[PDB]
Amino acid sequence: GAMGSMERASLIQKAKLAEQAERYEDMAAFMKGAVEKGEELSNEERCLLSVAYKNVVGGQRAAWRVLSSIEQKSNEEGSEEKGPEVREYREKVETELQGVCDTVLGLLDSHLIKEAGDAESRVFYLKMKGDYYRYLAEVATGDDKKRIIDSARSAYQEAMDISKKEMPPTNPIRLGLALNFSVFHYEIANSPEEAISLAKTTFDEAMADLHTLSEDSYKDSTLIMQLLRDNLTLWT
C-alpha cells in the first residue's frame, strides 16, 4: 500500500482534511490505508470510510448513468452510428466503478467484518457490503448477475436480522440500512411492494420509539425517517 509508511493517526487526520477540501478520492485512499493497519475502526472512523467511498462511487455512478443514457439513445431506431466510442468510454467508467467496489468489498472481507462483534460495527459493515454489491448489480449484465444481486440481498438481510435483535428501531444505522435495503428491493430486485412495505414498517416503528430519545438523537433519527417518507412519496 502506498500508505503503508504513514502513521494510522496521520491517515485519519488527513482523511478529515481531505473531507474539508472535498477531495474524496484522497479521503478514500487515506481511509483504505488506515483500515490496512489492521486495527478495528471506531464509530467516527467508520463514518469517514463510508463518506469517502460513498462520494467516490457516487460520482462514478452518476457519470455511468449519463454515459449509459447516451449509449441507449445511440442504439435506438434512426440514430446515426457514432462508432464504438460511447460503449468504450461507458466501459471505462464502469470498470473503474467496479474496481472501487471490489476495493471496498475487499476491505470488508479482509478483515473488517470478521472482527466486528458489536451491533453498531457489524451492522454498519454488512450494510456497506450490501451497498457495494448493489452498485455492482446496477452495472451487471453477465453470468454472475444473479449471484451479485443475491450477495447484496444476503448482506443486507444479515444486517437486518442483527439490527432487529440488537438495536432500537430509531437507531440511525438501522434506519439507514432499512432505507437502502428498501431501495435495493425497488431498483435491483424488481420488488416494489417489498420496498414500500419495508420503508413504511421501518418509519412507523421508529415513530413509536421517538419518545425515548433526547433532542439530539431525535434530530438524527427523524432526518433518516424523512428520507424513508421521501421515497414512499416517490413510489406511491
Binding site: 451497498d131 432505507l179 433518516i224 428520507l227 421521501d230 416517490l234
Partner: peptide, 5 residues
C-alpha cells in the same frame, strides 16, 4: 433517484 445513505 431515491434516497440512500
Amino acid at each position: 433517484f431515491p434516497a440512500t445513505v
